[PDB]
């Protein structure tokens, strides 16, 4: 079993970088007739890899679907990868590292990259909200609502 103690751990960011950029505007020439903020639909995937020993390379995938009315406006997908040299963590701690924390570092860069390609496609402004992967990860390990059943009784 996981017979490791002492909350020390260590990693250093070796490299942050975009691995993939995508922007498909299929209706673009015609859809510009509709001057409006196209309805945003978010997608998020997270991958990792082993380059060398203690050297793990996490890939954050963000995909943004958008449409003016009932027809597509734009489709902008970015994959912000990152090399991190991790040690000390294991079990729940390593699942928190590569499954939440490592994507959460890459997230601002993935955001600016999406907005760049939307700007290049001459579509309205796109700013994605900060998703705290680490907080929602803690809730994932239980898959249930928070327990704080009390009786203040203010009347």
């Amino acid at each position: 079993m996981s017979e490791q103690n002492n909350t020390e751990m260590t990693f250093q960011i070796q490299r942050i970088y975009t691995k993939d950029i995508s922007f498909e505007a299929p209706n673009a020439p015609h859809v510009f007739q509709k001057d409006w903020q196209p309805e945003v639909k978010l997608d998020l995937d997270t991958a990792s890899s082993q380059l060398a020993d203690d050297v793990y390379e996490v890939v954050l995938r963000v995909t943004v679907t958008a449409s003016l009315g009932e027809e597509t406006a734009f489709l902008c997908e970015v994959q912000q990868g990152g090399i991190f040299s991790i040690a000390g963590i294991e079990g729940t701690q390593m699942a928190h590292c590569l499954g939440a924390y490592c994507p959460n570092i890459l997230f601002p860069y993935a955001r600016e990259c999406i907005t760049s390609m939307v700007s290049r496609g001459t579509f309205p402004q796109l700013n994605l909200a900060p998703v705290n992967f680490d907080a929602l990860f803690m809730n994932y390990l239980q898959q249930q609502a928070g327990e704080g059943t009390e009786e203040h009784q203010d009347a």
Partner: peptide
């Protein structure tokens, strides 16, 4: 090598809101 995840393709991101398209 020291660790290894299932490689969560399916995430857990939930939000009762949107971007706020004004």
């Amino acid at each position: 090598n020291v660790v290894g995840l299932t490689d969560q393709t399916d995430l857990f991101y939930t939000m009762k809101a949107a971007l706020g398209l004004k």
